[PDB]
Structures are given as C-alpha cells and as structure tokens.
Coordinates of C-alpha atoms and ligand atoms in Angstrom, one line a residue:
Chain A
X301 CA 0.9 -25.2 -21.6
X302 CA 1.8 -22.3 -24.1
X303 CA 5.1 -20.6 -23.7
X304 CA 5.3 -17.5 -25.2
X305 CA 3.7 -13.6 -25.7
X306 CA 3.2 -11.2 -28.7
X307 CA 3.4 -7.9 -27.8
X308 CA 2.9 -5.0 -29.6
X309 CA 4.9 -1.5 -28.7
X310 CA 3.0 1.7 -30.6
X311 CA 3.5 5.2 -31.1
X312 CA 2.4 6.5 -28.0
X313 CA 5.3 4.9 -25.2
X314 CA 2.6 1.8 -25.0
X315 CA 2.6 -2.0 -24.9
X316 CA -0.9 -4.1 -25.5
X317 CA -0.7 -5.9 -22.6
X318 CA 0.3 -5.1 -18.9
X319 CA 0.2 -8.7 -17.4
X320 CA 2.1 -11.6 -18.8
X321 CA 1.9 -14.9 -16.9
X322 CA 4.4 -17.8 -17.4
X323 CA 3.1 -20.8 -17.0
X324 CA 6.1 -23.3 -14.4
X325 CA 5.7 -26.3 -16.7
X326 CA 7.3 -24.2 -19.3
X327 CA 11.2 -24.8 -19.7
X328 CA 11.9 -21.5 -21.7
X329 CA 9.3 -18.6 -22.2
X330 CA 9.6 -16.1 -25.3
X331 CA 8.3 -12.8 -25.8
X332 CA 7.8 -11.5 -29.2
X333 CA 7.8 -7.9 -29.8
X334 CA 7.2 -5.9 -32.3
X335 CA 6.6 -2.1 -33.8
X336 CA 3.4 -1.4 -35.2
X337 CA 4.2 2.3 -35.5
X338 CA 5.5 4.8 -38.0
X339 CA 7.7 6.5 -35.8
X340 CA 12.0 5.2 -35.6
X341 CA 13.8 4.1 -33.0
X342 CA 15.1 7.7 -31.9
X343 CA 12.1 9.2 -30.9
X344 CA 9.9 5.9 -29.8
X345 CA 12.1 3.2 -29.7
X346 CA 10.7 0.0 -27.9
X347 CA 12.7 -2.5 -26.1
X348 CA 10.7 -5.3 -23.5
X349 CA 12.8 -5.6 -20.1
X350 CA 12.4 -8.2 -17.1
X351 CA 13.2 -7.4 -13.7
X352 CA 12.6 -8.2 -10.5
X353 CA 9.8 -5.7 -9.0
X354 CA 12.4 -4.4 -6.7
X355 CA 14.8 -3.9 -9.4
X356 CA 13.1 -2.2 -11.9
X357 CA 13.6 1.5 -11.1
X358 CA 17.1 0.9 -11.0
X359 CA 17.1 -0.6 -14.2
X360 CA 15.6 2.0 -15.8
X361 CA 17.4 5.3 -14.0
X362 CA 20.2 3.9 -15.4
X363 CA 19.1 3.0 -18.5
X364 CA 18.0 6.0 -19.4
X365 CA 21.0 7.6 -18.7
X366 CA 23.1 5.3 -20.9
X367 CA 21.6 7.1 -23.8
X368 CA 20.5 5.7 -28.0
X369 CA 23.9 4.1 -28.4
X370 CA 23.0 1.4 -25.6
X371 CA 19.9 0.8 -26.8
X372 CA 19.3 2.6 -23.5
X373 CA 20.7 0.1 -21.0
X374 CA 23.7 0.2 -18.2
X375 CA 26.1 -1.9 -19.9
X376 CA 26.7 -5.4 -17.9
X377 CA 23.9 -4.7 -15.8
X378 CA 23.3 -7.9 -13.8
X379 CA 19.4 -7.0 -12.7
X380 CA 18.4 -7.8 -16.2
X381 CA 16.9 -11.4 -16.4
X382 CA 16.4 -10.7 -19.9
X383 CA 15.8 -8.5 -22.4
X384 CA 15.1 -7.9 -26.1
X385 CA 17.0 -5.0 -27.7
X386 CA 15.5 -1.7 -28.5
X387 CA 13.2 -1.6 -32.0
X388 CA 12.1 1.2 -34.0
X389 CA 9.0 1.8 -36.7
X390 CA 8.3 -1.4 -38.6
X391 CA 11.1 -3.7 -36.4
X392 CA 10.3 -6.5 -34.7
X393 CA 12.9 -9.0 -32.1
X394 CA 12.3 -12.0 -29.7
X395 CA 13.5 -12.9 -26.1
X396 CA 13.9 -16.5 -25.4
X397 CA 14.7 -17.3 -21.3
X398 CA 14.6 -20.0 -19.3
X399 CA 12.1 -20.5 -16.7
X400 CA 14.1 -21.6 -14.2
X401 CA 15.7 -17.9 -13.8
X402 CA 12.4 -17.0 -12.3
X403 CA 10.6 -18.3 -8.6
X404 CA 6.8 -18.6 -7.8
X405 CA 5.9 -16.0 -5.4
X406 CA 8.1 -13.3 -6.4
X407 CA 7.2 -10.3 -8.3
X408 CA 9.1 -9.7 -11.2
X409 CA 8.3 -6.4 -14.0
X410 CA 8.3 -6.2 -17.4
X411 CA 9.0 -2.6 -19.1
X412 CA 10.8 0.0 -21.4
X413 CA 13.7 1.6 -20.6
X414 CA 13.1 4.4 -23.0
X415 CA 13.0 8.2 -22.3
X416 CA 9.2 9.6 -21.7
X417 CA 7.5 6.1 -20.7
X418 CA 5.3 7.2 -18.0
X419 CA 5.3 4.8 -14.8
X420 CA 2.9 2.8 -16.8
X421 CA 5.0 1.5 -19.8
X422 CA 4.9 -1.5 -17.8
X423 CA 3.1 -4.7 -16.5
X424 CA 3.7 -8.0 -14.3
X425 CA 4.8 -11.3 -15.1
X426 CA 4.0 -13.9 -13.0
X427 CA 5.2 -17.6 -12.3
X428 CA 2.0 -19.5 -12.0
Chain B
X41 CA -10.6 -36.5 14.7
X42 CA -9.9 -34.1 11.6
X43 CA -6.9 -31.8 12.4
X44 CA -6.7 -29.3 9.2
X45 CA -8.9 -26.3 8.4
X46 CA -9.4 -24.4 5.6
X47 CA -9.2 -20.4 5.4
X48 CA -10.0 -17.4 3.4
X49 CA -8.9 -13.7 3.6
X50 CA -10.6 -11.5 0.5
X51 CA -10.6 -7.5 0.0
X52 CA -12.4 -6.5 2.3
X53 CA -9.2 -7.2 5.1
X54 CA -11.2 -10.4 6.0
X55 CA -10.5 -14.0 7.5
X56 CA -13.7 -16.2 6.6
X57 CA -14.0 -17.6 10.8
X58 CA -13.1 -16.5 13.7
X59 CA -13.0 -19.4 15.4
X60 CA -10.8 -22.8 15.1
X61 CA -10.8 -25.7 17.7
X62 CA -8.0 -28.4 17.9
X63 CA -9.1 -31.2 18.6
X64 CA -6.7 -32.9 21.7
X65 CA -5.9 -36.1 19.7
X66 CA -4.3 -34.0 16.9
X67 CA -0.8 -34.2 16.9
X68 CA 0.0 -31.8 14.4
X69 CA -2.7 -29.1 13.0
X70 CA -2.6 -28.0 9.1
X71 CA -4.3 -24.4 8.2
X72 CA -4.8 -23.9 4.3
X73 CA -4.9 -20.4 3.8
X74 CA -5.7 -18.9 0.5
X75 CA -6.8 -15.3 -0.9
X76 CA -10.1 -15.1 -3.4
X77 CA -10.1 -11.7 -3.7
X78 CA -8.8 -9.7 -6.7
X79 CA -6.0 -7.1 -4.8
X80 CA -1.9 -8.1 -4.8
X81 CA 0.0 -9.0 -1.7
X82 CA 1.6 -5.7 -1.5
X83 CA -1.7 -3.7 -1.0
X84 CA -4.1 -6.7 0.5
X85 CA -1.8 -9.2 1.4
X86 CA -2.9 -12.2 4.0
X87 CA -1.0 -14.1 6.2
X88 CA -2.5 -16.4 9.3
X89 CA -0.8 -15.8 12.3
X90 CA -0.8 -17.7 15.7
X91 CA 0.3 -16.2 19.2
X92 CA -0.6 -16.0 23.0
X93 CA -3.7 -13.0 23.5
X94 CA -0.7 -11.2 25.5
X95 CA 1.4 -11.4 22.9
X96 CA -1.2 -10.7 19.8
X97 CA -0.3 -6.8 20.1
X98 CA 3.5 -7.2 20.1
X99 CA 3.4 -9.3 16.9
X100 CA 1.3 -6.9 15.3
X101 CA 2.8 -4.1 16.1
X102 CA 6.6 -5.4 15.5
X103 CA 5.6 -6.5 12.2
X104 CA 3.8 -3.4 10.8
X105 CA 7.1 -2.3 11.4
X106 CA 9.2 -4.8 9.7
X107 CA 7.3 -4.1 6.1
X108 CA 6.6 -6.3 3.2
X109 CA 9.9 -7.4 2.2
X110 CA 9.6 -9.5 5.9
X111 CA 5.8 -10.3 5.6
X112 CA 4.6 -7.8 8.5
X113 CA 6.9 -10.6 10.8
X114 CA 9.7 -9.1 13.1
X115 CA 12.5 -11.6 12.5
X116 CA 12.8 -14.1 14.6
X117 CA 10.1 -13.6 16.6
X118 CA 9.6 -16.3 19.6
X119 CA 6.1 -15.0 20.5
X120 CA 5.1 -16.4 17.2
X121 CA 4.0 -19.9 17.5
X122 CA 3.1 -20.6 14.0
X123 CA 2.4 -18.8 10.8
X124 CA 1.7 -18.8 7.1
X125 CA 3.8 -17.0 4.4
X126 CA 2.1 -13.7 3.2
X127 CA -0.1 -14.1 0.0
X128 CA -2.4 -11.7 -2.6
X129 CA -4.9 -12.7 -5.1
X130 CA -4.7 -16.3 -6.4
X131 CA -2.1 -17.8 -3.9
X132 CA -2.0 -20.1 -1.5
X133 CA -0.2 -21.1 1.5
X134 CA -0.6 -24.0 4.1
X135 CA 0.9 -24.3 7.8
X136 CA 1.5 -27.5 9.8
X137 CA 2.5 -27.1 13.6
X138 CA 3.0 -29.9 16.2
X139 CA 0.0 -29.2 18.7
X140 CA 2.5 -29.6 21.4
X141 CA 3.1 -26.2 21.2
X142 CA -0.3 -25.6 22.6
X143 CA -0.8 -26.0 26.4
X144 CA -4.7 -27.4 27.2
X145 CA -7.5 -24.6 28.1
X146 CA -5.0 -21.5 27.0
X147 CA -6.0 -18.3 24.9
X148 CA -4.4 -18.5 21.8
X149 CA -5.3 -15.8 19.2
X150 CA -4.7 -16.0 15.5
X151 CA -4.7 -12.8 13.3
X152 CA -3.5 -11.2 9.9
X153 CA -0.1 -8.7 10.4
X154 CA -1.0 -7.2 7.0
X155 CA -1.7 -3.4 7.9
X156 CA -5.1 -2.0 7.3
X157 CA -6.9 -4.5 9.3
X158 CA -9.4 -3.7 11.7
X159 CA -9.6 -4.6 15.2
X160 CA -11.3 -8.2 14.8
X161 CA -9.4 -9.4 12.2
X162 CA -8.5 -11.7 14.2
X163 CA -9.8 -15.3 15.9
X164 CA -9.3 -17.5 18.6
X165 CA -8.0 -21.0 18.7
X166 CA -8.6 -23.7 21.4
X167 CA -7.9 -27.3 22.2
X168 CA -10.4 -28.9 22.1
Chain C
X604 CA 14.8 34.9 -0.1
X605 CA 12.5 32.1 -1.3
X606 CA 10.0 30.8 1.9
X607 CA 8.6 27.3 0.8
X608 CA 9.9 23.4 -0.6
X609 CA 8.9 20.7 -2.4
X610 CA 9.1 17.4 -0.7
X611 CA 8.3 14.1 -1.8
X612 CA 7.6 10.6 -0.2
X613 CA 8.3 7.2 -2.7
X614 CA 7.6 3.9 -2.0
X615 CA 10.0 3.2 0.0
X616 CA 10.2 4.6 3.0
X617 CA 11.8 8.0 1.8
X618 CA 12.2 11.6 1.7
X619 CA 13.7 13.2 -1.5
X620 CA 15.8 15.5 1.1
X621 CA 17.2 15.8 4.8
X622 CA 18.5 19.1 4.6
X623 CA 15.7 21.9 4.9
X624 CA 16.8 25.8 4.8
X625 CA 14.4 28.7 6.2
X626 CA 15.1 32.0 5.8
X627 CA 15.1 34.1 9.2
X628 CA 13.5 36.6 6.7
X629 CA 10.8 34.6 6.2
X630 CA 7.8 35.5 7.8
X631 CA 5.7 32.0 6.9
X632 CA 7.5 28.8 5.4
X633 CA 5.2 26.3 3.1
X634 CA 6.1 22.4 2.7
X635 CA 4.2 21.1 -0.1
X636 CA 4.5 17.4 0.5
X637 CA 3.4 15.1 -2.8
X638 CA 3.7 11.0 -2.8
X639 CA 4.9 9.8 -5.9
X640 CA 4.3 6.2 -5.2
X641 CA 2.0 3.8 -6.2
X642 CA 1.0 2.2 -2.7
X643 CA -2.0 3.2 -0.4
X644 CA -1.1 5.3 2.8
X645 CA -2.1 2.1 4.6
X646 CA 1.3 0.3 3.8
X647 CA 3.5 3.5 2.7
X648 CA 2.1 6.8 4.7
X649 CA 3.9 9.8 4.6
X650 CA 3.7 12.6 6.8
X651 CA 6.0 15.5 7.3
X652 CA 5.9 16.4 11.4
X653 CA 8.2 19.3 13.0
X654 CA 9.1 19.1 16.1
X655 CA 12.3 20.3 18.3
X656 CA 15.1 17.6 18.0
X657 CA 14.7 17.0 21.2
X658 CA 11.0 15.9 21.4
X659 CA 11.4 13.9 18.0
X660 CA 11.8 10.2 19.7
X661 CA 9.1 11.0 21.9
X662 CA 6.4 11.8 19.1
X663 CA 7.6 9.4 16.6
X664 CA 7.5 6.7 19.5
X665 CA 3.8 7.7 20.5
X666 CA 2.7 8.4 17.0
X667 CA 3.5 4.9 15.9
X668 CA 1.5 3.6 18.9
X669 CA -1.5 6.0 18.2
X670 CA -2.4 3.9 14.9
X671 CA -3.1 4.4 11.4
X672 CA -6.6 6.1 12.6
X673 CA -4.9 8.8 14.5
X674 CA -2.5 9.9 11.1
X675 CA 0.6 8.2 13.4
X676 CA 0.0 11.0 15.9
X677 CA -1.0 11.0 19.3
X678 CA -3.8 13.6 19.6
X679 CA -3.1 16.9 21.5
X680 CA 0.8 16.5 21.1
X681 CA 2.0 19.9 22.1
X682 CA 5.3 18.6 20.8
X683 CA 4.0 19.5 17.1
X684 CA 5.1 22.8 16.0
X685 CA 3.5 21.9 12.3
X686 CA 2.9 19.0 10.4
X687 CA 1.0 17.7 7.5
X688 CA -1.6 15.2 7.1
X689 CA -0.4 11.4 6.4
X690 CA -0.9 11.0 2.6
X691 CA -0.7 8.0 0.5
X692 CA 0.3 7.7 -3.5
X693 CA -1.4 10.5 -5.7
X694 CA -2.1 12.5 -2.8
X695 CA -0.4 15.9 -1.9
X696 CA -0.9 18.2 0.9
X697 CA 0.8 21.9 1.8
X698 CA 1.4 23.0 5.6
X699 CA 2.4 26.7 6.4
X700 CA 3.8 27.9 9.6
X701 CA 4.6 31.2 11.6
X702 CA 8.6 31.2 11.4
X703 CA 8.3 33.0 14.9
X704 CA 7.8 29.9 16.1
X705 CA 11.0 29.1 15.4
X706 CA 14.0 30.5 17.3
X707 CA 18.2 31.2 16.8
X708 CA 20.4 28.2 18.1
X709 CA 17.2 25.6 18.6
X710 CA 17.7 22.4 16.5
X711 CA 14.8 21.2 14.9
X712 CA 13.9 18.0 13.2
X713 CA 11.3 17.0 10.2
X714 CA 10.6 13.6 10.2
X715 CA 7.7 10.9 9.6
X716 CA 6.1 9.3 12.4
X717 CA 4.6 5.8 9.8
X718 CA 5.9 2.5 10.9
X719 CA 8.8 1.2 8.5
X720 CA 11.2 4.1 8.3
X721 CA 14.9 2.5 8.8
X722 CA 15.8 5.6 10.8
X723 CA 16.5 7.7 7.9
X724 CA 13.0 8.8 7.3
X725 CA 13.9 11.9 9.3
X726 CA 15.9 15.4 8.3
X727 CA 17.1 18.8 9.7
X728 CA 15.7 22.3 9.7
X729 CA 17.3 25.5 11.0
X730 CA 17.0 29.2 11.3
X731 CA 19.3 30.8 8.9
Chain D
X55 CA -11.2 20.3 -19.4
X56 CA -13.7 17.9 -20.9
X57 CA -16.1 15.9 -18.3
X58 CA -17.2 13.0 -20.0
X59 CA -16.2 9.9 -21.9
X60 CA -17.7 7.2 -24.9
X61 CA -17.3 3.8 -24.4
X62 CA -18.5 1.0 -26.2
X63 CA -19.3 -2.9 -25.2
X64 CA -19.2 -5.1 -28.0
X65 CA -20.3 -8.6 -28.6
X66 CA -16.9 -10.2 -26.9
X67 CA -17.9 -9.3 -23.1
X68 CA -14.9 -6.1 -23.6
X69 CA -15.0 -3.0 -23.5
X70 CA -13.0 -0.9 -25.9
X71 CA -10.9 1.1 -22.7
X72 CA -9.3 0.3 -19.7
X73 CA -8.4 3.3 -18.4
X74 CA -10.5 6.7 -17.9
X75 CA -9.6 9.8 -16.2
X76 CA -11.4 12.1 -14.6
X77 CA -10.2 16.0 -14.5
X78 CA -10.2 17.6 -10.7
X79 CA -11.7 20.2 -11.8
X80 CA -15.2 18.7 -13.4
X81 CA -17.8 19.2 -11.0
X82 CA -20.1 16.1 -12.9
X83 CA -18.4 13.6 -15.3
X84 CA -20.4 11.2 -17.7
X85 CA -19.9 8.1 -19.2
X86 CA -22.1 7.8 -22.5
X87 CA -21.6 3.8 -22.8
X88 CA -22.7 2.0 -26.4
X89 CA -23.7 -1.4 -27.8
X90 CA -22.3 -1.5 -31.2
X91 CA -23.1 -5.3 -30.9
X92 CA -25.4 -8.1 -32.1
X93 CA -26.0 -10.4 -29.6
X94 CA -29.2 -9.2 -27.0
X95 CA -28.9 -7.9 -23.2
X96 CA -29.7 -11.2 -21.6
X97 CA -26.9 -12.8 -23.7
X98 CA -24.8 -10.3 -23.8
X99 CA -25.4 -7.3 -21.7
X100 CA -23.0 -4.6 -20.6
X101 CA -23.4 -2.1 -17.8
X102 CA -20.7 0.2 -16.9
X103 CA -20.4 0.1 -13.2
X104 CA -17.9 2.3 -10.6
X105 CA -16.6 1.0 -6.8
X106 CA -13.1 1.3 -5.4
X107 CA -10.9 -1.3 -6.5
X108 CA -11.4 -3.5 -3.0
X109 CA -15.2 -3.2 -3.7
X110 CA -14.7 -4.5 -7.0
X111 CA -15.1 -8.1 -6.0
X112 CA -18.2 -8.2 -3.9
X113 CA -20.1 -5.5 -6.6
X114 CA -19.6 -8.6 -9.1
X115 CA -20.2 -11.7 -6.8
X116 CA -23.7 -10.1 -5.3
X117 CA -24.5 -8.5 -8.7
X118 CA -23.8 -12.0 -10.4
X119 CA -26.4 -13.7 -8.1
X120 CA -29.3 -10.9 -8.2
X121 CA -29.8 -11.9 -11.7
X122 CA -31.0 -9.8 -15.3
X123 CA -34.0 -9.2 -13.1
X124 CA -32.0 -6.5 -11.1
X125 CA -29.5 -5.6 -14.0
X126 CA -26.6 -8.0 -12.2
X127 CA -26.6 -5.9 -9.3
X128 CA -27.8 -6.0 -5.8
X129 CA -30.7 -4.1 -5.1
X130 CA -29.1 -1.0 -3.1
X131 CA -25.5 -1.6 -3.0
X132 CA -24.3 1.5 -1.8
X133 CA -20.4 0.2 -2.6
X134 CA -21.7 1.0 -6.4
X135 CA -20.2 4.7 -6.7
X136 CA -22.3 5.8 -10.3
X137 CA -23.1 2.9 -12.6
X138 CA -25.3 2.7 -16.4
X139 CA -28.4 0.6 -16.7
X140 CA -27.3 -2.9 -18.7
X141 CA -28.1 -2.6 -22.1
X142 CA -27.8 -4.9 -25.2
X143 CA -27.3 -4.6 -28.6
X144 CA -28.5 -1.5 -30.5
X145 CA -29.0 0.2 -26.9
X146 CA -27.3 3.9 -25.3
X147 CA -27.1 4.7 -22.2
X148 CA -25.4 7.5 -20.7
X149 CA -24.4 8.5 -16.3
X150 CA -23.6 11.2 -14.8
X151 CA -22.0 11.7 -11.4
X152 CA -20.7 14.2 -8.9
X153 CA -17.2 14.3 -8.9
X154 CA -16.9 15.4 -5.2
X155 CA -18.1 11.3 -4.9
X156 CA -14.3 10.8 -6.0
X157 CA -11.2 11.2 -3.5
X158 CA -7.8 12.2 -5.2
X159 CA -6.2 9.2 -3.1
X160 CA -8.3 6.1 -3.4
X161 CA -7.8 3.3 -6.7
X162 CA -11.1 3.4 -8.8
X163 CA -12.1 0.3 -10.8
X164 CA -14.9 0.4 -13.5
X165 CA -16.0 -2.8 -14.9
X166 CA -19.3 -4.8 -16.2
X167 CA -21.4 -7.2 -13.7
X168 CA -22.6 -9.3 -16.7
X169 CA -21.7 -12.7 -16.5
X170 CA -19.6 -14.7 -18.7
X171 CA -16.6 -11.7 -19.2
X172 CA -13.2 -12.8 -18.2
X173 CA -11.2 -11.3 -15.6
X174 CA -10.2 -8.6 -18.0
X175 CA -13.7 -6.7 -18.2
X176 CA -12.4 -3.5 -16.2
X177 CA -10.6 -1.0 -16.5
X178 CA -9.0 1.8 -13.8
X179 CA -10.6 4.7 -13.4
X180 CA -8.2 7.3 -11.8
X181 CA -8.5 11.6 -10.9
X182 CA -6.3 13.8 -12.6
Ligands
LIG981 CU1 3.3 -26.6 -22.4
LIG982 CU1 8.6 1.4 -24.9
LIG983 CU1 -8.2 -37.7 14.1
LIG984 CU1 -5.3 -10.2 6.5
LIG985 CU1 12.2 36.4 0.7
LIG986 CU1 7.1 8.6 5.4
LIG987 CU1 -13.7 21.9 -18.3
LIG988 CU1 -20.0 -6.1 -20.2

C-alpha cells in the first residue's frame, strides 16, 4: 500500500482534502504539507494536527489560546498524536508517525489550530 | 445445517430481513453484519441486537440513553443475549453466540439500538 | 432591564449556561435557542422546556418515554409553562412567554427532556 | 444575496465544487451546470442532481440501473429534490428550484448519477 498524503494549505483557512485514509499494512504514515499561498505565517499560518475525534476541540481551544509564539499549540499537550509545525507563504514541513498509535474503528481528526478556521478546516483519517 | 447469516443495515435505518431461523442442530450461530450505505456511525450507525420480545423495549430504550460513546447499549445489560459492535459506512462486524442461550419455540426479537429507527426495524429469530 | 438570552446546545449533551436571570420588570422574556453542533436532532436534540422544579422529573421522565416523534414531550402536559421545539445542528428557534406566569418565591427549572443528558442538561430560572 | 451558482463537469467524472450554499432568503436558486469537456454524454455525461444526504445512495443505485435511456435516474423518483438533464460535452443546462423545498436543518448532497465517477462526485449543499 502507499503511505503517505500531500496536502496543500491556501490562503483562505483551507486544506485540499478533508478525508485521509491510512492504509493498516502501513508501519509509519507521513503527511506532507505545504503553502501554496502568498500570505506569511502571521495572518494564515497552516499547521496539520491529528486527534482523536473526541479530542479535537480541546486541542484547538487551547491552541488557539497559546498564541504565534507556540505555533499555536498548548505546550506538552498529550492529545496530539502528531503534528507538523505551523508554515507560512511559500513553507512547506512533513509528519512522519507510526501506525500503530492509531486503532481501526476509532475516529480520529485531522485540522488547524490556527485563529479564524471555521469548523471546516478539517477532515477524517481513517484506519482501513 | 448452515448456522451463520449474513446482514445489511443501509441509510435508509434498514436491516435487509426480518426474519432469521436457527436451525436446532446449531451449536453456535454467527451473524455478519455490515453497513453499504454511505452515512458514518455517529449519524446512521448499525448494530444487530438480540433480546426476549418483553425485553426488546427496555434495551432500546436504555440504550438511546447510554449514547454513542456506549453503542446505544446500557452497560452491562443481562436482557441482552447477544449483539454486534456499532458500525457506519464501510465496516463490518460479526457475532457468534452459543445457541444454548436460546430456549426451543420462544420469541426472540433482534433489532438496531441506533436512534432514528422506525418501529419495525427490527426481526424475529426462531429455532428452528 | 434587558428581557431575553441566548442559549446554545453542542454536541454533547450541553447547555452553554444554568443560570437564567428575568427581570420582574419584564413583561415578556425571549430564549433564542441555536445548536451549534454538527449532529442531527435524531442523536443530539435539544430543547429548552420550563417547568416548576417541582414537576421537572415528572416531564423529563414522560417526555423521554413519549419518543423522538412527540419532540420528547408528552402531549397536553400542563406541566409546561413554555418551551421550544427540539432542534438539531443548524437549526434555531425563539420561545416568548408572559412573565406573569411566573410568580415571587416559586423555583423554576429549564431543562431538556432528549435521552443522553448526564443530569446536567438542566438549569435555574428565578424572578428577580 | 445572489440565487444561483456555475458549475462545470469536465472530462474526469468531477465536478469543479463540492460545496454550494444556498441564501435563506432566495425564494428560487439555480444551478447553471457546464461541459467544458470532450468526451460525449453516453461516455461521459454529468447531471447535477439534489436528495438529502441519506437519499444519496438509493438516487445513484436506481439511477445507475435505469440507464442513459432515462438520464441515470429512475423514472419519478420523488427523493430527487431539483436535478439538470445529463449533458455531454459542449452541452448547458441550467435548474431552478424553490427554495421553500429546502429545510434549515436537514444535510443536502448534490452529486452526478453517471456511472464510472468515484465516490468523490458530490459535493454538500447546505442553507445559509
Ligand atoms: Cu505498502
Ligand atoms: Cu490552516
Ligand atoms: Cu449444520
Ligand atoms: Cu440500525
Ligand atoms: Cu427592561
Ligand atoms: Cu439538549
Ligand atoms: Cu438577493
Ligand atoms: Cu458527472
């Protein structure tokens, strides 16, 4: 099977996909992200974040909170499977996890923890 | 005799029978559930469910109650005599009970716990 | 003084308050109920349902029995001062009430009468 | 507000959207949907065609077996909300519908009954 994702953050608080599925004979998965945009990191920065579906609001309350010099994360925060860090105009950065982390059956979320994503700057990943 | 059957619940809030007959020389009895339809778990989820007719309503109704996170199942419930996990689109699940469970000639009723479902989702089963 | 609120439902089984204030110089009081969520009213209704504390067991116990057809409530309950619709995610509705109806050292309860709530889903109101 | 939308079916079974909204207050709305494409209707046709997102499923299947005869759908499906004529390459085709046919709480799914297009030709259609 394949193991990894592009996926392309633009100027508008959007990703170019909203579904990612990890495939179980994969050992680690990686996501590739990168900024197509003009715009830097302070006013549409893009980081990809993977939760579990129960976590995710959590995650991102608090990650908003934590403000630019966090890359807008709660420091140590344990509901985090993974996570690249936040990219700006041009940037690009890669997540490399292990499958394991994850279970079949179990909703997890992928997302941005920056300011003004509406509650659709984010999609599923699945363990198939 | 054969002693496994094979179900589907789509979404429309839909089993694909409403009938299932154990044959007497089965000593255990397989049901192979699985959801065709296109809607998650969390808004069309399926389960297959197995109880006395006197106790049909309890189950249902103690499970609307216990919500998603316990797959529309009140913990611990003895009135259940088997049951499959709760799945959405593109899962599957499979349940093998020992048919000494079931007593010759008896109404047994299985049925989805999943709210939204009408009246008749639901089925009998009978040794047969 | 100010006669109306804002009260939200989430996915989760919740108010955004349990504390409502109403003016004794208020001649009508408006709750604007929105749901915020994502999920249908079929797994995560809200309503918003006055009655006295007294009576509020008795019409949350025979709204729950009354079914998802009935909005949670049994029909003709003269226990209802006031009460909104049940409303799933995206949907909003506004009850006003006569604040006559509503008398000095009477407590009174708001509270949601869908299957799920971990006794929580409920909140004062008082003349003050 | 503005009541109506372009969309455009190329010669790769997608679409060129996946999300559409609709402004409460439009009384009609339109959808003026375009084959910028090569490859002829019964090859590559595209329809533009409305249900609730539990509808989705059985709009496709029954469309899928009524064949290019009946434009992929079956003949008087009233589960088909508003809905284009199939058209190939070079070909327009524009719908209008009442607006009152939509409900502020229900999930809308638009998609093509073609066959051949993955899982991914839809898109949400949503009131705002
Ligand atoms: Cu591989
Ligand atoms: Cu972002
Ligand atoms: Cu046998
Ligand atoms: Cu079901
Ligand atoms: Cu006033
Ligand atoms: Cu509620
Ligand atoms: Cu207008
Ligand atoms: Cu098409």
């Amino acid at each position: 099977a394949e193991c990894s994702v592009d996926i392309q953050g633009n100027d508008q608080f959007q990703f170019n996909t909203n579904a990612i599925t990890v495939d179980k004979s994969c050992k680690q998965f990686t996501v590739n992200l990168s900024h197509p945009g003009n715009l830097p990191k302070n006013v549409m920065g893009h980081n990809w974040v993977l939760s579990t579906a129960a976590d995710m609001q959590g995650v991102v309350t608090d990650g908003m909170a934590s403000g630019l010099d966090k890359d807008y994360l709660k420091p140590d925060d344990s509901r985090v499977i993974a996570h690249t860090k936040l990219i700006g105009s041009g940037e690009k950065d890669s997540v490399t996890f292990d499958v394991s982390k994850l279970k079949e059956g179990e909703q997890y979320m992928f997302f941005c923890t920056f300011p003004g994503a509406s509650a659709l700057h984010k999609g599923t990943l699945t363990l198939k």
